[PDB]
Ligand binder design. Sequence first.
Ligand SMILES: Nc1ncnc2c1ncn2[C@@H]1O[C@H](COP(=O)(O)OP(=O)(O)O)[C@@H](O)[C@H]1O
Ligand SMILES: Nc1ncnc2c1ncn2[C@@H]1O[C@H](COP(=O)(O)OP(=O)(O)O)[C@@H](O)[C@H]1O
Lengths: 48, 48, 48
Amino acid sequence: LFVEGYKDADYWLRRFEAEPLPENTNRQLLLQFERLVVLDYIIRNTDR
Amino acid sequence: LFVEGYKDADYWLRRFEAEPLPENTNRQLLLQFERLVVLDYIIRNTDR
Amino acid sequence: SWRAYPFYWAWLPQAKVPFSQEIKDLILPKISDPNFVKDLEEDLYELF
Ligand SMILES: Nc1ncnc2c1ncn2[C@@H]1O[C@H](COP(=O)(O)OP(=O)(O)O)[C@@H](O)[C@H]1O
Ligand SMILES: Nc1ncnc2c1ncn2[C@@H]1O[C@H](COP(=O)(O)OP(=O)(O)O)[C@@H](O)[C@H]1O
């Protein structure tokens, strides 16, 4: 399935270094980031 | 009023530099920090 | 070699944050349950 209006992770990451996120959004981002860690770790992605 | 079990803010902030905090606690720190900022700015503290 | 296929997100500052309670609650019941893990291998086998 196709998903709309996403960007390269590090496009935003670089921007968040420059202009940080409000903390509530940042917490949200981390919640999501953790789900990526779990996924990549279990399947042991060789290419992330 | 004397408050019990605090340390110099920098003692912790540098410890939160090695160990970062869990995000929920960190959100709490920031919430408190914002209140510090508001207070010191309105009274234009000279010595913080 | 352990250097060969890194998880690139491990270098991000976000990767320094202890896991939240949210992820522990979503994942631990599942992956610490031998039945769940066995269902997973089953589902995967079925696909592969
Ligand atoms: N489901 C999707 N929704 C939106 N964009 C996608 C989706 N899948 C892939 N893309 C975009 O299209 C490009 C090609 O997709 P993919 O083949 O998955 O990556 P790669 O080019 O690294 O093999 C990617 O750079 C990605 O940004
Ligand atoms: N309300 C308070 N509760 C607990 N500890 C305090 C409180 N106020 C000051 N302290 C501690 O005692 C010391 C008091 O010094 P401070 O309040 O900076 O005034 P001064 O520098 O004039 O002595 C500080 O080092 C601080 O760690």
